[PDB]
Amino acid sequence: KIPVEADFLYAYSTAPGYYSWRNSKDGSWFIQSLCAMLKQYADKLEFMHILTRVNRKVATEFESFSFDATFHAKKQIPCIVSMLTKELYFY
């Protein structure tokens, strides 16, 4: 017998209340930088450990550019919510 709302893992593209960014030629920052990590560590790391490097590769190497005063020079930081009651290792 376990908690129903358990084992659920949600990886939001940004921090609550904030906007999520997107490139018109590569697409999302969050999605490209995510797949790219599962590209390297899909069998090396756990998953939170992946999702965390994904957090850095999006908080560190991504910065908006725009001719708009408001929509320019803006950052983004993902959100890793986890209820999982165990580790995960795709393999």
Binding site: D7, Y10, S13, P16, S20, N23, K39, Y89
Partner: protein, 140 residues
């Protein structure tokens, strides 16, 4: 033990809900790039062994059904679950290609006591969207 059990015959099923063009009504701008994602994605979970089924531009009453269509299903021999949603959004709300829709009702079918074959297995939800209208000016 400590780490999940992932040695079931079928790794899972990775439905991606690629939403891009929004009903003029919704007033939601057409997301350019969404496509580049859905492909780099479908290709990603294909290499990890998931049954990826991509659906495009689905109204609110449509994502909800697919979901009950997906909760009700023998995931018995399936090891896990992955739902990738790419669309517009607010906080707690995701968007249909016709109207905004409450996230709660979506994820609910797969709840321990509603989706019992998935019970004990990890429901991995990846949401790609607008949790509001705040900008990070960045320090340092």
């Amino acid at each position: 033990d400590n780490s999940y059990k992932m040695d079931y015959p079928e790794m899972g099923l990775c439905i991606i809900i690629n939403n891009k063009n929004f009903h003029k009504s919704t007033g939601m701008t057409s997301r350019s790039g969404t496509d580049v994602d859905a492909a780099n994605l479908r290709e990603t979970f294909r290499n990890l062994k998931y049954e990826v089924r991509n659906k495009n531009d689905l109204t609110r009453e449509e994502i909800v059904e697919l979901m009950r269509d997906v909760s009700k299903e023998d995931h018995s021999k399936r090891s896990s679950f992955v739902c990738v949603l790419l669309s517009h959004g607010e906080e707690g709300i995701i968007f249909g290609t016709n109207g905004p829709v409450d996230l709660k009702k979506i994820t609910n079918f797969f709840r321990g006591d509603r989706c019992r074959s998935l019970t004990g297995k990890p429901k991995l939800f990846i949401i790609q969207a607008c949790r509001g209208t705040e900008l990070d000016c960045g320090i340092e």
